[PDB]
Amino acid sequence: MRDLKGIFSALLVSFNEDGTINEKGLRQIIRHNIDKMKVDGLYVGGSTGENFMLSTEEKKEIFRIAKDEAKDQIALIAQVGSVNLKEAVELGKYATELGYDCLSAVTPFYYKFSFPEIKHYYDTIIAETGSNMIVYSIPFLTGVNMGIEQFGELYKNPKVLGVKFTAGDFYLLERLKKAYPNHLIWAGFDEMMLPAASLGVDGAIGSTFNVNGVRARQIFELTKAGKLKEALEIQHVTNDLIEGILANGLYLTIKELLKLEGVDAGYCREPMTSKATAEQVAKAKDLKAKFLS
Amino acid sequence: MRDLKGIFSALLVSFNEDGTINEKGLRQIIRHNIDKMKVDGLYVGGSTGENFMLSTEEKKEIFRIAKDEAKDQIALIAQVGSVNLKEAVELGKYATELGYDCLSAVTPFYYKFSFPEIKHYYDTIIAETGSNMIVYSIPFLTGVNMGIEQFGELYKNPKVLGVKFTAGDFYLLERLKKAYPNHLIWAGFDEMMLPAASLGVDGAIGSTFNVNGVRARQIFELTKAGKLKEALEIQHVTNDLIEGILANGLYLTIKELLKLEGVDAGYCREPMTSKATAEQVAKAKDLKAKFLS
Amino acid sequence: MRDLKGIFSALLVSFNEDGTINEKGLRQIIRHNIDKMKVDGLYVGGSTGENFMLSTEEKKEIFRIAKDEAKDQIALIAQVGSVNLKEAVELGKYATELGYDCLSAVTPFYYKFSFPEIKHYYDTIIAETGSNMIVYSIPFLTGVNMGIEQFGELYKNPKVLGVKFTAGDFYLLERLKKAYPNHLIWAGFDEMMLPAASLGVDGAIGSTFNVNGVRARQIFELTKAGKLKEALEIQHVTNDLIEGILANGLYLTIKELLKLEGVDAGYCREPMTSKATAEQVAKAKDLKAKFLS
Amino acid sequence: MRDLKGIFSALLVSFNEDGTINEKGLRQIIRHNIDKMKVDGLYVGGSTGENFMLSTEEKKEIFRIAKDEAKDQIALIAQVGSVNLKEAVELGKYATELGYDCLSAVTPFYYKFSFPEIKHYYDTIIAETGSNMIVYSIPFLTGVNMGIEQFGELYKNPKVLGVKFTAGDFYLLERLKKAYPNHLIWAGFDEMMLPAASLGVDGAIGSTFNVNGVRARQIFELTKAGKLKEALEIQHVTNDLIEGILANGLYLTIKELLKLEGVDAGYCREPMTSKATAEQVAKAKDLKAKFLS
């Protein structure tokens, strides 16, 4: 089984002004991550990919392009989760047939599902696809907060490999490491990569790695090497850039910094604001000069 | 235009064990609401309809059947919102062509959309379809809370008629009545019908009206006539029933209650637990006996 | 025991520039309430009285003054709750000795107390004083939310008379009226008096009744007769006033509105901002001319 | 100026059955911390000391005893915060008079104070005592969250030394280190010591150091030496112990664990449940056996 540890960018997608996928740009974002950011893999179709604003056919298109462009150069995880479990199975099977290395699914959201319902959800996607599974936990958007005993129940299925922890509860993260030492953890908060790596997370899945991939690998590797002082300096610089990106508008600022690298990262998909304002373009240029030149 | 005030059932949908729509059963639920519950209209494709777990074609299928079964006997409101704005627009056009009386859309969820983007979403649906719109507010599931000034901005669009207020903030409720006297308000919390009718809401859109339509009508009409002691008594009985329904499982218990009236309400759609347990079936029968016999 | 239903002003207290109690001003506030606002009673030492920023001796002084000035003109409730249960008991005994008609106690705060702990706290204050008790709900300032079954457990003590309900949950409100018909409810949200009265609350305890008692009484009395539209016109004006009071700073604005009636309501007690700026004073003068002249 | 970095136990207080202070037991808790736990200091009068359920004279007693028993053997911080700002100044001056090294104050709670009000509160305690101050973050009990800009304003006063950070926001933690490099940060989450130490916190104030002082020092210093794998092993044993402590009831379990060391840590002060049950006692003895023997 292809190794899933390390540094994975959460793949941003380039959209045309009309909301349709810009394939040429998306291939450029992919090439930049693989060739310039030097990531170990791509995490395709997650919240960062503007996934939940798209139809099933568009989701399939993005998975088709990403796999054809990356080929076997890097590891690929397919995020196929959704409120629609039939859609999730459908998408899981499609990515599996394409050769994705592993599936991932957000906890079903909107409705307040019970834990058994969440569990059936994960077990079904695995049983209908035959693929391995990474629980995608992002409580800030889902409102789903699972405790240590519930992760143990999910882990009864041997195809559940671990969790993409897009949450800042570092006690729970240590508890997960203690209770399930053979299960993987990927940090989801780029601006807290140092403290997550201090507790032994196995990798990181991040939206800022599309542009800050060099620094993110250094933080990860220096921290695992016991060079905390060195990692902290690079996490400080990284956070000045992340703070700017958050203040200027996460999605649009990453796409604008990508455009400054010559990648046609396009526009955001509506209902997200699709076009950067003047001021937003100005700020991106400034972040570029200060932190990525 | 068709009158949109009064008592509206939020239509539940009958599903087969495999998750496909049971058309025959759905037509039975529809007839029950019109013929026995004596509703003024149906609210199709809401949360209650298990709408966010379905594919776009399934949503069009439910809209088609509901319109074909109901024809022009009662008022029909089509809930077409989603995280996908292109899908909302598609569904909005579809229901418009079918002849629904007005559309409605949940505030875009999952991503934390800004107010301007939420207003754009509503204005886009309106521009693309040409239909009137009822803002669908359900903070408990969406996490979106809008204050009085934001409602005013949404109301600058003359096609916005008002709001389905599925929240229990009665100060905000009075503020809306005070500030926008020409805009309608439909109460969305069945167990708080009396206090909402004491502030003059124009109607009620509710899931328990599928089985407790006679009492709901009474509470609403008795409150408007100033008969608060008589209304409260019926609200008390109604809330014993709702407390039982909520304790036993809202979706499955309304469905099991419909089955005791000989309506083939079927199962719930996965990720929701699809079949009721033996305890759930027994509790429904006991509620049937106690409150709807 | 004395009748405790009706309109109760949550007594505000007059402080000097240095934070000490201004007795003459406090007596003027009491007199304005009894003689002009025509209240049924006063609720003394509650949050509105700036009670939790004071020492025990100050709370005792306020109790002494208020009983001395009101004599037996109106009903008097004494809020004696605290995080210190020994202080609660001392204050409960003191107000009992003075002739307060009943006590009240906020749910113990700061620490996260269990329900058995909260119930023991109320049972102890009652046992050590021999007085009747009004329990709370106020979750906005305590973060303590109790359910129907927890109120039942508190109501096993025959000296608990009911609850001061300062939380907007009208479902819980109707459930309390259903299960405990002989237990009293006082609404604590002045901007939601109408809908609370619509469900038969027995009275209301509010901070705005120190200046708007006339209207508060009308809303209550009109709602009770089923004259909803007339009550609502008075609730609408009342909420324009309240909206203005809330935006300008609640405590200082009610005190500035009292000063415009010739009542020396003085300053607020630090940590709260003690002095109203020039813009706050002007806004209160405007509110007085528009709504209280 | 005495060095305030390192390991501080948040001092538990021994109470008699009647809620009064057990002086003899309190001196024994102090002696165990200093001589066996080998702390660098004690944090006296904080939430862990049950301070908020006590009278002003009891707080004073505890400061007197603590200083008399510890003398100048270790650093001593006095927590003097309260909803009552006059009480905060009185305690601040008393502890300054006793020769405490630095003061601390929780953010004023119960009412929702504004930032200027909180800053005024801190600036008043400092002006009135002449002592240094450690501010708080602590959102779980107070509900007050503050950002870099506001810490900036607090830090304009040169007598503010830094912050006792008791909520786990590691992004805010790094940003604080970045913006204000010379300002100190004491971690307040014993179960997240490792990640806090990886970001360079200056020390830790913890309730569990009263019994697990030795492992707390090792985590802190190994982490600072970049020996993360060894650090993590001790954090994992520590967290098994804290998980057990938390499940059994924090305050009572640390006191029963001290009793097993020959310390008369006595009872909790009402409203907290004052005496441990047979099951709580037995679980403490089991935790002692597995983790502290």
PDB file of N, CA and C in Angstrom, chain A residues 186-235:
ATOM      1  N   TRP A 186      -3.412  12.996  10.741  1.00  0.00           N
ATOM      2  CA  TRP A 186      -2.851  14.052   9.877  1.00  0.00           C
ATOM      3  C   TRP A 186      -3.345  15.392  10.431  1.00  0.00           C
ATOM      4  N   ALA A 187      -2.439  16.278  10.804  1.00  0.00           N
ATOM      5  CA  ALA A 187      -2.890  17.601  11.277  1.00  0.00           C
ATOM      6  C   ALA A 187      -3.526  18.405  10.143  1.00  0.00           C
ATOM      7  N   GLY A 188      -4.619  19.089  10.463  1.00  0.00           N
ATOM      8  CA  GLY A 188      -5.394  19.902   9.574  1.00  0.00           C
ATOM      9  C   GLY A 188      -5.214  21.393   9.794  1.00  0.00           C
ATOM     10  N   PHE A 189      -4.633  21.807  10.919  1.00  0.00           N
ATOM     11  CA  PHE A 189      -4.399  23.233  11.194  1.00  0.00           C
ATOM     12  C   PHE A 189      -2.953  23.619  10.943  1.00  0.00           C
ATOM     13  N   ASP A 190      -2.724  24.196   9.772  1.00  0.00           N
ATOM     14  CA  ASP A 190      -1.415  24.612   9.293  1.00  0.00           C
ATOM     15  C   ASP A 190      -0.686  25.534  10.246  1.00  0.00           C
ATOM     16  N   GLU A 191      -1.426  26.418  10.906  1.00  0.00           N
ATOM     17  CA  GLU A 191      -0.850  27.398  11.817  1.00  0.00           C
ATOM     18  C   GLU A 191      -0.544  26.827  13.181  1.00  0.00           C
ATOM     19  N   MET A 192      -0.834  25.553  13.395  1.00  0.00           N
ATOM     20  CA  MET A 192      -0.508  24.813  14.614  1.00  0.00           C
ATOM     21  C   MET A 192       0.236  23.517  14.272  1.00  0.00           C
ATOM     22  N   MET A 193       0.956  23.526  13.159  1.00  0.00           N
ATOM     23  CA  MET A 193       1.718  22.352  12.740  1.00  0.00           C
ATOM     24  C   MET A 193       2.778  22.027  13.764  1.00  0.00           C
ATOM     25  N   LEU A 194       3.515  23.001  14.318  1.00  0.00           N
ATOM     26  CA  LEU A 194       4.560  22.660  15.299  1.00  0.00           C
ATOM     27  C   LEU A 194       4.075  21.882  16.498  1.00  0.00           C
ATOM     28  N   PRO A 195       3.094  22.325  17.264  1.00  0.00           N
ATOM     29  CA  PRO A 195       2.546  21.601  18.412  1.00  0.00           C
ATOM     30  C   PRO A 195       1.917  20.272  18.024  1.00  0.00           C
ATOM     31  N   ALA A 196       1.321  20.118  16.847  1.00  0.00           N
ATOM     32  CA  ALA A 196       0.788  18.808  16.434  1.00  0.00           C
ATOM     33  C   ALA A 196       1.916  17.817  16.172  1.00  0.00           C
ATOM     34  N   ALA A 197       2.970  18.282  15.494  1.00  0.00           N
ATOM     35  CA  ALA A 197       4.139  17.449  15.207  1.00  0.00           C
ATOM     36  C   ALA A 197       4.870  17.127  16.505  1.00  0.00           C
ATOM     37  N   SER A 198       4.773  17.937  17.538  1.00  0.00           N
ATOM     38  CA  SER A 198       5.402  17.631  18.827  1.00  0.00           C
ATOM     39  C   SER A 198       4.807  16.412  19.499  1.00  0.00           C
ATOM     40  N   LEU A 199       3.550  16.107  19.189  1.00  0.00           N
ATOM     41  CA  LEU A 199       2.834  14.953  19.714  1.00  0.00           C
ATOM     42  C   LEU A 199       2.881  13.781  18.751  1.00  0.00           C
ATOM     43  N   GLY A 200       3.681  13.825  17.701  1.00  0.00           N
ATOM     44  CA  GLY A 200       3.868  12.742  16.775  1.00  0.00           C
ATOM     45  C   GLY A 200       2.840  12.566  15.671  1.00  0.00           C
ATOM     46  N   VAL A 201       2.165  13.608  15.193  1.00  0.00           N
ATOM     47  CA  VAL A 201       1.212  13.351  14.070  1.00  0.00           C
ATOM     48  C   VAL A 201       2.016  12.775  12.908  1.00  0.00           C
ATOM     49  N   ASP A 202       1.450  11.930  12.052  1.00  0.00           N
ATOM     50  CA  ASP A 202       2.099  11.274  10.949  1.00  0.00           C
ATOM     51  C   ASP A 202       2.226  12.076   9.673  1.00  0.00           C
ATOM     52  N   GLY A 203       1.459  13.163   9.570  1.00  0.00           N
ATOM     53  CA  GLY A 203       1.515  13.976   8.336  1.00  0.00           C
ATOM     54  C   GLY A 203       0.643  15.211   8.586  1.00  0.00           C
ATOM     55  N   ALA A 204       0.435  15.995   7.557  1.00  0.00           N
ATOM     56  CA  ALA A 204      -0.370  17.191   7.645  1.00  0.00           C
ATOM     57  C   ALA A 204      -1.079  17.386   6.310  1.00  0.00           C
ATOM     58  N   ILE A 205      -2.347  17.779   6.354  1.00  0.00           N
ATOM     59  CA  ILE A 205      -3.110  18.027   5.146  1.00  0.00           C
ATOM     60  C   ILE A 205      -3.511  19.504   5.289  1.00  0.00           C
ATOM     61  N   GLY A 206      -3.013  20.316   4.374  1.00  0.00           N
ATOM     62  CA  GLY A 206      -3.159  21.756   4.535  1.00  0.00           C
ATOM     63  C   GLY A 206      -3.390  22.518   3.236  1.00  0.00           C
ATOM     64  N   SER A 207      -4.239  23.536   3.408  1.00  0.00           N
ATOM     65  CA  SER A 207      -4.554  24.381   2.253  1.00  0.00           C
ATOM     66  C   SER A 207      -3.426  25.353   2.010  1.00  0.00           C
ATOM     67  N   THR A 208      -2.644  25.787   3.007  1.00  0.00           N
ATOM     68  CA  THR A 208      -1.576  26.753   2.717  1.00  0.00           C
ATOM     69  C   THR A 208      -0.349  26.120   2.086  1.00  0.00           C
ATOM     70  N   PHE A 209      -0.303  24.777   2.061  1.00  0.00           N
ATOM     71  CA  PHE A 209       0.853  24.108   1.474  1.00  0.00           C
ATOM     72  C   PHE A 209       0.862  24.250  -0.031  1.00  0.00           C
ATOM     73  N   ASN A 210      -0.247  24.642  -0.651  1.00  0.00           N
ATOM     74  CA  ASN A 210      -0.317  24.955  -2.062  1.00  0.00           C
ATOM     75  C   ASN A 210       0.655  26.081  -2.400  1.00  0.00           C
ATOM     76  N   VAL A 211       1.003  26.963  -1.458  1.00  0.00           N
ATOM     77  CA  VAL A 211       1.925  28.051  -1.675  1.00  0.00           C
ATOM     78  C   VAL A 211       3.090  28.061  -0.674  1.00  0.00           C
ATOM     79  N   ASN A 212       2.923  27.481   0.501  1.00  0.00           N
ATOM     80  CA  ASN A 212       3.953  27.523   1.523  1.00  0.00           C
ATOM     81  C   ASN A 212       4.544  26.160   1.852  1.00  0.00           C
ATOM     82  N   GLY A 213       4.485  25.237   0.905  1.00  0.00           N
ATOM     83  CA  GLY A 213       4.969  23.877   0.987  1.00  0.00           C
ATOM     84  C   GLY A 213       6.395  23.681   1.461  1.00  0.00           C
ATOM     85  N   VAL A 214       7.297  24.597   1.096  1.00  0.00           N
ATOM     86  CA  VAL A 214       8.715  24.478   1.483  1.00  0.00           C
ATOM     87  C   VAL A 214       8.830  24.658   2.982  1.00  0.00           C
ATOM     88  N   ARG A 215       8.290  25.784   3.481  1.00  0.00           N
ATOM     89  CA  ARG A 215       8.305  25.986   4.926  1.00  0.00           C
ATOM     90  C   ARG A 215       7.551  24.908   5.688  1.00  0.00           C
ATOM     91  N   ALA A 216       6.346  24.492   5.252  1.00  0.00           N
ATOM     92  CA  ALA A 216       5.613  23.466   6.010  1.00  0.00           C
ATOM     93  C   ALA A 216       6.443  22.198   6.162  1.00  0.00           C
ATOM     94  N   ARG A 217       7.146  21.731   5.123  1.00  0.00           N
ATOM     95  CA  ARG A 217       8.001  20.526   5.310  1.00  0.00           C
ATOM     96  C   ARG A 217       9.096  20.763   6.345  1.00  0.00           C
ATOM     97  N   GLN A 218       9.759  21.919   6.329  1.00  0.00           N
ATOM     98  CA  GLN A 218      10.804  22.247   7.283  1.00  0.00           C
ATOM     99  C   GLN A 218      10.269  22.188   8.713  1.00  0.00           C
ATOM    100  N   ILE A 219       9.120  22.811   8.972  1.00  0.00           N
ATOM    101  CA  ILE A 219       8.568  22.773  10.322  1.00  0.00           C
ATOM    102  C   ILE A 219       8.354  21.339  10.792  1.00  0.00           C
ATOM    103  N   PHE A 220       7.651  20.570   9.953  1.00  0.00           N
ATOM    104  CA  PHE A 220       7.400  19.170  10.248  1.00  0.00           C
ATOM    105  C   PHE A 220       8.673  18.395  10.543  1.00  0.00           C
ATOM    106  N   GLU A 221       9.622  18.456   9.585  1.00  0.00           N
ATOM    107  CA  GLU A 221      10.882  17.704   9.776  1.00  0.00           C
ATOM    108  C   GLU A 221      11.751  18.184  10.906  1.00  0.00           C
ATOM    109  N   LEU A 222      11.945  19.492  11.084  1.00  0.00           N
ATOM    110  CA  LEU A 222      12.699  20.026  12.219  1.00  0.00           C
ATOM    111  C   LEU A 222      12.059  19.646  13.549  1.00  0.00           C
ATOM    112  N   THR A 223      10.725  19.670  13.609  1.00  0.00           N
ATOM    113  CA  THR A 223      10.064  19.337  14.882  1.00  0.00           C
ATOM    114  C   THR A 223      10.294  17.872  15.217  1.00  0.00           C
ATOM    115  N   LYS A 224      10.135  16.945  14.281  1.00  0.00           N
ATOM    116  CA  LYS A 224      10.340  15.531  14.497  1.00  0.00           C
ATOM    117  C   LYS A 224      11.819  15.265  14.837  1.00  0.00           C
ATOM    118  N   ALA A 225      12.743  16.085  14.353  1.00  0.00           N
ATOM    119  CA  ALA A 225      14.154  15.994  14.655  1.00  0.00           C
ATOM    120  C   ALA A 225      14.565  16.577  15.998  1.00  0.00           C
ATOM    121  N   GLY A 226      13.661  17.170  16.761  1.00  0.00           N
ATOM    122  CA  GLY A 226      13.979  17.762  18.070  1.00  0.00           C
ATOM    123  C   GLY A 226      14.561  19.161  17.949  1.00  0.00           C
ATOM    124  N   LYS A 227      14.529  19.750  16.748  1.00  0.00           N
ATOM    125  CA  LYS A 227      15.055  21.113  16.595  1.00  0.00           C
ATOM    126  C   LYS A 227      13.910  22.109  16.763  1.00  0.00           C
ATOM    127  N   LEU A 228      13.366  22.253  17.945  1.00  0.00           N
ATOM    128  CA  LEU A 228      12.233  23.105  18.210  1.00  0.00           C
ATOM    129  C   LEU A 228      12.455  24.576  17.971  1.00  0.00           C
ATOM    130  N   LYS A 229      13.626  25.090  18.329  1.00  0.00           N
ATOM    131  CA  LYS A 229      13.942  26.505  18.151  1.00  0.00           C
ATOM    132  C   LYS A 229      13.916  26.886  16.688  1.00  0.00           C
ATOM    133  N   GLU A 230      14.492  26.015  15.840  1.00  0.00           N
ATOM    134  CA  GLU A 230      14.520  26.196  14.412  1.00  0.00           C
ATOM    135  C   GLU A 230      13.135  26.073  13.771  1.00  0.00           C
ATOM    136  N   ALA A 231      12.376  25.088  14.253  1.00  0.00           N
ATOM    137  CA  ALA A 231      11.011  24.930  13.730  1.00  0.00           C
ATOM    138  C   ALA A 231      10.174  26.133  14.133  1.00  0.00           C
ATOM    139  N   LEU A 232      10.291  26.584  15.380  1.00  0.00           N
ATOM    140  CA  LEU A 232       9.486  27.724  15.814  1.00  0.00           C
ATOM    141  C   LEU A 232       9.742  28.980  14.991  1.00  0.00           C
ATOM    142  N   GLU A 233      11.014  29.237  14.622  1.00  0.00           N
ATOM    143  CA  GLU A 233      11.254  30.408  13.772  1.00  0.00           C
ATOM    144  C   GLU A 233      10.494  30.305  12.464  1.00  0.00           C
ATOM    145  N   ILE A 234      10.507  29.121  11.846  1.00  0.00           N
ATOM    146  CA  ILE A 234       9.810  28.970  10.570  1.00  0.00           C
ATOM    147  C   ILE A 234       8.290  28.961  10.759  1.00  0.00           C
ATOM    148  N   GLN A 235       7.768  28.471  11.887  1.00  0.00           N
ATOM    149  CA  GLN A 235       6.345  28.531  12.167  1.00  0.00           C
ATOM    150  C   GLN A 235       5.895  29.983  12.416  1.00  0.00           C
TER     151      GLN A 235
END
